[PDB]
Each structure stands twice: as structure tokens, then as C-alpha cells.
């Protein structure tokens, strides 16, 4: 069978296989928490420019794409986080925008690989835009050619907010979600003030969010999970005893916490009908739910319907002791962080963004200014180079004269003997001026951009307040003591 | 449990390992390269028509099985069309392929190729039940392990491996320095390393370097292990203004000469000797013209060593030499490489032997069937006109004589166009004819020298057929 005699390999072997699984699978990243295939997923549709601008797309063509341009690993992870970046229910905020047949929230999860057509989001958009921006390195896949990114940078802390998955790997972790805006308000308060403290912000945070809007009470969970991120709290749904014309009473419900079945409870109350360990209960019914969700249990009269709500919110799963696990990963070690930390490594993130895109477009303008430099150059002394020009010979004699007259290199020696006729104007003389001092400020204003540091913090703030502009974010949750 | 998991662990490694890792000892020929060839030989199309512009291939091999990419799988086309990196050769291809230049060919199923000429005669013998087979996950047609050789491709093509423990470099060698040298282990069980010397005087490739160590070639014959030296060609030649110029033709190996030519132009352009403004390295198509002019007030000679210390133009290059068999990886040497290729080509002629064993007496059963028919006639057909079924025929025939019933339904299959007695003679002669290459085969199995006669029969046929020289020029 195995027969393998040396303990070395095993080991290492071993040790190759137990980082694999923890790399293959869903991982608390530094930039973005997510799985590698969420970010296969984004840089295939970046790089293929499939815009929601432009209509929509069979997407399993698509799927098939980026699995024949990455390894050839199985499609059915693929699939799934396909259509969980589609669930508009799960993940708190959009990525992609189906167009076909899913299930809403009741445990068909409908997988019509055939009808699979849909677009994205634009909030890629705020995501990544990559392009000429030297940031991050690649590995190469088809006997090795074709480029991958290690990480996602990006300039928002978005998918801290979002929520993960990575449990079964080795131990358990997730990332619970809040939402954005008060988020963005204690970010930039910990960017103007470096010095503050934790439950001042909580102060500016409220809970932890839902997307369904649930009832939270309790802050001690509160307290010990913005710290160190363990802890179950306390959630409830939105309940409400009402009356009829009649006067019989109706436990109405319109959400519940995360997690949680309309339809396996649904059959859980059937049960306790059945178990016939409840009382009161007459009817159990629920219709018109798609312009709003209405579940309503009715009850008969004389049966002190709220300590019934209270045998619901003991006994059922109703109530949901909903737990917390938020152990880092900060370049392969796992750790484990508090929410400055996180915030901490973000803004050291946006520095090295903001100096790298910065010093590429340094080099853009330095390597243009040379080009003008040549021009203007050229421009001085015009009729010596024609003169130049019709003595000479070759191309090491023309670059010696104008090394020895000008002192100037090869390219731009070459940029100086591609001029035509047609660029000898005057106007277009003075235009290669204007736009040469235009160049010469843009360094100069990116040197001043180098001077201080802070210049970055303000325009990060700016474009967070551009972002929550376009992107307001109301609560839906509701957070008591 | 975690029992469990080590078991996860060690047959998910097994599985990464002898997936994309090192292949067997007994080919050399990893299997998505070997299910490339083996596809392209079920084909059917010779290479005699015109080679085939098509990505229907490849979609039949990812019909055979499903990879993490079969752009990997058109990377494992397009490297083994890579003549100047993996050696002669495996494509008979037309379109765009590039070379050793940082060439990107996106014209994927517009390249033309199909079946080469080494492939031909590599991958014979199918037809003869040599090799064994396992199902696809398809659970639809078959594919081998492992493939019949003519020689030792091991050799002939290296390993550029990657490190899911740690990688692998194996260098090429020559065809009929092989062939010597299988001809060497054949003669003599107790060769030596020098006489590996002798018919490997060193290892080659399908550029040229200069390899000018002995010792770290000997450490890498024995130990498996150790580092050499590749060195471009240097020629120094005279300049009429008097300048030392330097000619270039070989390089070390994949070492393209784009990004060494642009850290030659930053080593100059960073307070350095500036006055070798003379680069002229173009013109490679008739071969390479890598020409630099040293500048005057200057040697040639310590700009050489400047760029041997930028480790361009003379690198050492390790060697790992690993390999994967019996499921386990091996450190590897000579009389290894060497008797598994002979112990492998004994396992494939002796069942080539045994079925045509198989097919010769199972026709000489049926000429057996045809004699004795051919003996007395006239009297089975009255038997015959005394009876009304096949199977009171059959009946019939095993109360006349000794007989299959494959052999009396053989007989059963005679016209009139039977009833001669020429043919009489004519299936005789073939029937003796067949005894003879019988007992000839059974003579054969008992003869140890034989099979080794055999496979100097093969390599004498690819001997007239093909050979190769050393055109990587090596001074040690």
C-alpha cells in the first residue's frame, strides 16, 4: 500500500499539506479576508472588463474561463461562492448581480448551472484598479506563464465590515459584520487622532450588524468581543403582541437573527404543537410574504400570550446565542487582533498604495520630462543639428555629437531625430513648453506629497465621504441594554 | 482522527506529487505529457499528412480528464514545442512558438501540430498487451501509467521540477552516447565511472555552454548532487581601430539575453566604465551574433569577469536529481537510470513475446483444424447429406475426429472454393512455417542474451535511422 520508509518526506509532505488546506481554504487575510478563488473571481472579471455598464453575461462560460486560465481545481467551491457573491440576502453588501434562480432564504438552494447569467456590482470599482499600479507580486500557472496576485489591496476596509466563513480548516474563526458608515466615522477619527481610546469609539460603534435587522440586548459580550472577539451574545426577533377586532391576540414576527430558516422552524413549531409542550397556540400561518416578510402565530384568549414570547425565546431557536471567533491571519502566522489593529495595518496598507501609485506616476512624468527635455533641447540650437545632420554619418556618430554638445542620452538623442516637419511650429513649440511646465508642477505637487504625510490621510477621508455619499448607510438592526 | 488526517495529508501529497511533480524513473514522461502523447497517438493521423491546426485535440484530452486548467495543458504543447529549451524533439508544429526571448505566443489552437517522427517508434507495441491500463473517472475509456520506451529519455530531456519538497534539475545528454553507453551496461555489469566518462563525456544541450569543471561532473554522476559552471562563448577578435571585441554565441541555460542585456545597460549607467557604448547583439536568426566592443583603454578580459561575477554569462548551476518511483522518491545515480530502463525493455519484449506466443498458436490451432480437414472430405460431406443441423454436424465431427468448436465451425466455413488441393499445400507450408517461429520464440524465452540481442537490433534501427553530436562545445 503506502510503504513509504523515509519520515522526512512524510513530515514534510505533511507539513506542505496541513498550510495547503489552510491556504486553499476560507482565511482572515490582511487586506481581505476572503477565499483566493473570491479574488481568482474579481481579477478575471477586472481584467476581462466585464462592466456593469455593459449587459449581462453567461457566467458558467465565464466560470469555465478563469478555470482553464488558473489551475484546474473543482468546480464545486467555484459554483457555491459564485452564488453566495450573488446572494443579496447573505453577505451584507453586493458583489454580483444574478439575473436567474436561487432560493430566497429557505433552504432551496436552486443551482441552474445553465441559467447562470449575471453581471457584477460597482463597488469593484472602489475595490481595485490595478492597472499600471505596481503593488503586488504574481505566480505563474501554465508551466508557468500567466500572472496571479498574491493579495487584494484595495482602499476600504469593506470586506472587514462584510463577515467570514473560515472554520473547519484547523480551528474555528469568522468575521461578523457591521455596517459602513459609522465605521467610516471611527476610522477617520483614529486617522486625525492616533490617541484614542476603545470605548470612546464604542461610543461611535454601535453593535454588530445584521442584515436582516435583529434585536440585540446586552454589552458585556459587547465589551469583551470588541476586545478580544470571543463570546456568544443574545439576539431576538422583531415580535409584537397585537389585537384583533375581536380582541384575540396574534404574536406577529417580521425577522429573525442570522441564520435561521423560516421553514425548519416552521416544522419545529408543527412539532411543538405535536410535543404538545405549548398551549394557546391556534394558528400557524403565513402568506403575502413577498412584498414583506409576515409570519403570524394566533392564539387563543386567557393564555398570558408574553410568557409564551418568553417560552419562545428560551426554548426555540428564536432566541440566538450567536458567537464570536475572530482569529487573525497577518502573512501566513495566525493571530488574533483587536479592532485598532485591524485599522492599524489598513492604514499602513494605504500608505504603501498611495507611495507606490504615487512614485509610478512619478516615473511617468520623469520619463515624459526627459522626452520634453530632448524636445526643448532640440529646440535650442536647431540649425547646429541640421548642420549636425548633414555632416554625420551613423548613429554612433550622431549620439557622440549631441553627447558631446548637449550631454544627453541615446533615447533621448533618438527622441530628438524622430521630429518631423509638421511638429516645427511655433504653437506646438510653445505647447511642448506649456505642457513640460505643466509636467514640472505635477512633480513638484507629488514632491509636496512627499513632503507630508498627512496630505494622503485627507484625501483617503475625502474619498470615504464620496463613497458614504454615494453608499448611505441606514441601520436596520436595533441595539438595547 | 487525526490519524485520518495524517492519512489526508500523506495521500493528498502522494496525489500533488506524482500528479505535477517529478514523473516515474521507468519514462521520464510526466502524464499530462504522457497523456498528450498517448492522445495524439489515438489520433491515428500519421505525421505523413499535414500536421493539424486544431484544439479539438486538446479538447478531447480534457475530455479525458479535467485539470485545474487546460491553458496548462496548451503550456505543456507549447513546452514541449520549445526546442531550444527541451531537447529534439516532440512537436511537429508550424505556428507560433517563439524562443528563448520572453515570447508570448496567445494564438492558441492556430499553432498547427500532430505526431512526431521519435514518437513514432517511441510508442509502438500498444497492439501487443505490454502495458497495463486503469480507467478514467469518466468510467469510459482507459489510460496507461507508464509507456514503452526506446531509450531513456531521462537522459536525453532533463527536469526543471518545482519545489513541493524541493525541485529537480536534470540535464539533457546525447542520443548515441546513450545508446553507447546502454550498449556498455549490456556487456559488462561491472563498469565503473570512468568508463560513464567514456561514453558520456559530459552532459549537452540544444544551445551550447561551457562547462569547465571535473569534479562537480563527477560528484553529480555519483552523489546526485552538486553544481556546475555554464559559461557563454567568448571570442576575442581585432577590431581595425583597435578594440577587443567580444563574440558571443553561447549563453547558460534559460538565460534569456532581453533583461542580461538591460542590467549590463544599468552596470554601466551606474558610475561605471561608461565608454562601451558598442552593443551590437542582433541578427539571431541566422544563429547568435551577441557582440559587444570593449572600449579603448580597456581590456576585454576583466569586463568578461565583471559580467561571469554578474552570473549572466557564467552561472553555477546546481543540480538536485531526484526521482519518483515504487511510489517513493529516490536520490538518484548511474546503474539505477540504467538498469531500470533494461529490466523495463526485458518486461516489454518478453510480453511482447508471449503474445505473439498467444496469437501464433492460436492460429496454429486453426491450421491444425484446416490439415485435418483437408486430410479426408468426402466422407464428412455424406455425414453431412446424413444429417440437417450444425449441431448434429458438430455432433458429427466429434464422432469422426479431434476437434474445437471453433475449429469444427472453422470447417464448417468452407466453400467450394475449399476443395482443392493446392491449398492443401499452401496451408502446410504456413502451418510448418508457424511451428518453425514457434519453437523459434520458445527457443528465444529460453535465452537470456537473446532479448539484449533485440534491443541492439532497435537501437541499430534508430542508429541508421538518427543520430546526434555534441553541439554543445564543452572545454574542462
Same mark, same amino acid.
Given at each position: ?38 479574488? @481568482? ?15 449581462? &453575461? ?40 444574478? /439575473? ?8 432551496? #438552494? ?10 457584477? #456590482? ?12 505596481? +503593488? ?7 508551466? =508557468? ?8 489591496? =484595495? ?27 459609522? +465605521? ?43 476586545? +478580544?472577539?470571543?463570546? #456568544?451574545?443574545? $439576539?431576538? #426577533? @422583531? ?11 396574534? %404574536? ?11 421553514? &425548519? ?6 412539532? $411543538?404543537?405535536?410535543?404538545? @409542550? ?41 432566541? +440566538? ?6 482569529? =487573525? ?19 499602513? /496598507?494605504?500608505? *504603501? ?8 506616476? &512619478? ?14 533641447? =532640440? ?9 549636425? %545632420? ?17 550631454? $544627453?542620452? *541615446? ?37 509636496? %506629497? ?13 474619498? $470615504? ?17
Amino acid at each position: 500500500l503506502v510503504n513509504v520508509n523515509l519520515t522526512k518526506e512524510m513530515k514534510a509532505s505533511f507539513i506542505d499539506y496541513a498550510m495547503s488546506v489552510i491556504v486553499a481554504r476560507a482565511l482572515p487575510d490582511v487586506r481581505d479576508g476572503l477565499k483566493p478563488v473570491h479574488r @481568482r473571481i474579481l481579477y478575471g472579471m477586472n481584467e476581462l472588463g466585464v462592466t456593469p455598464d455593459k449587459p449581462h &453575461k453567461k457566467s458558467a462560460r465565464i466560470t469555465g474561463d478563469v478555470m482553464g486560465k488558473y489551475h484546474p481545481h473543482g468546480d464545486s467551491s467555484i459554483y457555491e461562492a459564485m452564488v453566495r457573491m450573488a446572494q443579496w440576502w447573505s453577505y451584507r453588501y453586493m458583489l454580483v448581480d444574478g /439575473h436567474g434562480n436561487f432560493g430566497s432564504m429557505d433552504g432551496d #438552494s436552486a443551482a441552474a448551472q445553465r441559467y447562470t447569467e449575471a453581471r457584477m #456590482s460597482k463597488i469593484a470599482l472602489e475595490m481595485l484598479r490595478d492597472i499600471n499600479k505596481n +503593488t503586488v507580486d504574481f505566480v505563474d500557472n501554465y508551466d =508557468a506563464n500567466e500572472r496571479e496576485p498574491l493579495v487584494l489591496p =484595495a482602499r476600504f476596509p469593506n470586506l472587514l465590515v462584510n463577515g467570514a466563513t473560515g472554520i473547519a480548516v484547523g480551528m474555528a474563526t469568522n468575521i461578523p459584520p457591521h455596517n459602513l458608515g459609522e +465605521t467610516i466615522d471611527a476610522v477617520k477619527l483614529v486617522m486625525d487622532n492616533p490617541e484614542v481610546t476603545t470605548k470612546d469609539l464604542m461610543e461611535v460603534l454601535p453593535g454588530p450588524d445584521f442584515p436582516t435587522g435583529a434585536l440585540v440586548m446586552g454589552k458585556s459580550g459587547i465589551h469583551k468581543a470588541y476586545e +478580544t472577539g470571543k463570546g #456568544s451574545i443574545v $439576539l431576538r #426577533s @422583531r415580535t409584537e403582541i397585537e389585537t384583533t377586532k375581536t380582541g384575540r391576540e396574534r %404574536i406577529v414576527v417580521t425577522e429573525f437573527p442570522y441564520m435561521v430558516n423560516k421553514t &425548519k422552524v416552521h416544522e419545529h413549531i408543527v412539532r $411543538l404543537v405535536q410535543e404538545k @409542550r405549548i398551549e394557546g397556540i391556534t394558528a400557524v400561518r403565513d402568506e403575502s410574504n413577498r412584498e414583506g416578510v409576515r409570519f403570524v402565530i394566533e392564539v387563543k384568549r386567557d393564555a398570558s400570550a408574553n410568557v409564551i414570547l418568553n417560552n419562545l425565546f428560551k426554548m426555540t431557536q428564536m432566541q +440566538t446565542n450567536f458567537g464570536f471567533n475572530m482569529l =487573525a491571519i497577518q502573512n501566513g502566522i495566525p493571530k488574533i487582533l483587536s479592532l485598532r489593529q485591524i485599522l492599524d495595518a489598513y492604514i499602513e /496598507h494605504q500608505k *504603501e498604495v498611495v507611495v507606490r501609485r504615487t512614485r509610478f506616476d &512619478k516615473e511617468k512624468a520623469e520619463a515624459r520630462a526627459h522626452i520634453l527635455e530632448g524636445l526643448l533641447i =532640440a529646440l535650442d540650437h536647431i540649425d547646429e543639428v541640421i548642420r549636425i %545632420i548633414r555632416a554625420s554619418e551613423t548613429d554612433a556618430e550622431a549620439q557622440a555629437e549631441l553627447m558631446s554638445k548637449f550631454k $544627453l542620452s *541615446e533615447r533621448q538623442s533618438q527622441a530628438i531625430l524622430d521630429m518631423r516637419l509638421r511638429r516645427l511650429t511655433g504653437l506646438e513649440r510653445d505647447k511642448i513648453q506649456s505642457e513640460y511646465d505643466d509636467l514640472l508642477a505635477l512633480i513638484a505637487d507629488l514632491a509636496d %506629497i512627499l513632503a507630508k504625510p498627512e496630505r494622503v490621510s485627507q484625501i483617503i477621508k475625502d474619498e $470615504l465621504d464620496e463613497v458614504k455619499r454615494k453608499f448611505s448607510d441606514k441601520r436596520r438592526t436595533e441595539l438595547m441594554v
